[PDB]
Swiss-Prot record:
Protein name (Swiss-Prot/TrEMBL): Lysozyme C
GO cellular component terms, semicolon-separated: cytoplasm; endoplasmic reticulum; extracellular space
UniProt-annotated location(s): Secreted
Organism of this sequence: Gallus gallus
Subunit structure: Monomer.
Gene Ontology molecular-function annotations: beta-N-acetylglucosaminidase activity; identical protein binding; lysozyme activity
Tissue specificity comment: In the egg white and polymorphonuclear leukocytes.
Gene name as annotated: LYZ
Length: 129
């Protein structure tokens, strides 16, 4: 599923991401835009052999099991394919654990490099939220 901007904002708000650990909703929509272009089916391989999955590009090195990342962890206790679903629940619940791990949203390289320090509220302008 390729989400619309306001559609994703509304679903993220309903799932409790608005101001989660102090990150306003625009931060999450900005992160999703530059991580996956709002596409739940996005995948990208990393140099170490791990793979990033879904709308927030969650990494198999620590967070999910994809059967092809030996020696890795599965801290969200999910198969990585669950993160590609049109239902974003698994992605949001895993993202809540990531952002709580001490580094905040700096865990997402696209957020640090393209969202941090910008007017992130622009990403929800016009939405009925
Ligand atoms: Na893993």
């Amino acid at each position: 599923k390729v989400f619309g901007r306001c559609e994703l904002a509304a679903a993220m708000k309903r799932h409790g991401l608005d101001n989660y650990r102090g990150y306003s909703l625009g931060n999450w929509v900005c992160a999703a835009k530059f991580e996956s272009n709002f596409n739940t089916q996005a995948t990208n391989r990393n140099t170490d052999g791990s793979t990033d999955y879904g709308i927030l590009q969650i990494n198999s090195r620590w967070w999910c099991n994809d059967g092809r990342t030996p020696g890795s962890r599965n801290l969200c206790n999910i198969p990585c394919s669950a993160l590609l679903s049109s239902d974003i629940t698994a992605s949001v619940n895993c993202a809540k654990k990531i952002v709580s791990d001490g580094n905040g949203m700096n865990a997402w390289v696209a957020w640090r490099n393209r969202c941090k320090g910008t007017d992130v509220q622009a990403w929800i302008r016009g939405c009925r939220l």
